[PDB]
Design a protein around this ligand. Structure first.
Ligand SMILES: O=C(NO)c1ccc(-c2csc3c(=O)cc(N4CCOCC4)oc23)cc1
Length: 131
């Protein structure tokens, strides 16, 4: 039984935009979304169809780049560091659930190695954007 996808909207929670959140959605995500191994992390993990035992019991915070992307388009994140946590949650969940060295781990590691390179290009200073 797969739970509903994580909320990408917050009808009671602050809606905000940033030149850093702008660089994330328009640069680092495009570069990640077009990566060779970026297809398993474009949507929520289908544990039932993949028959991953006790996945949602081991993984308390299921996350994926499809959820992260829609959150960037709905100004779900207050700042950029909040968005970097969803990427760290996504990667670590794969490292916690799978054997070190497996294909799915290697694909998240290469995807993460590029992510750490890309976010290092974000603006050091945070400036709001007129949303
Ligand atoms: O659509 C797909 N393939 O056609 C696909 C594949 C894999 C994933 C995926 C993302 S994270 C993750 C994971 O943690 C463990 C497992 N495994 C470990 C056991 O073998 C089957 C895979 O699948 C994932 C998502 C989509």
């Amino acid at each position: 039984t797969n739970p509903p996808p994580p909320e990408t909207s917050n009808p009671n929670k602050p809606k905000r935009q940033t030149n850093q959140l702008q660089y994330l959605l328009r640069v680092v995500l495009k570069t990640l979304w077009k990566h060779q191994f970026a297809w398993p992390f474009q949507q929520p993990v289908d544990a039932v169809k993949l028959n991953l035992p006790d996945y949602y019991k081991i993984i308390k915070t299921p996350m994926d780049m499809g959820t992260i992307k829609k959150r960037l388009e709905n100004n779900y994140y207050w700042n950029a560091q909040e968005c970097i946590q969803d990427f760290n949650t996504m990667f670590t969940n794969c490292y916690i659930y799978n054997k070190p060295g497996d294909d799915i781990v290697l694909m998240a590691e290469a995807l993460e190695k590029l992510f750490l390179q890309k976010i290092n290009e974000l603006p050091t200073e945070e400036t709001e954007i007129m949303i």
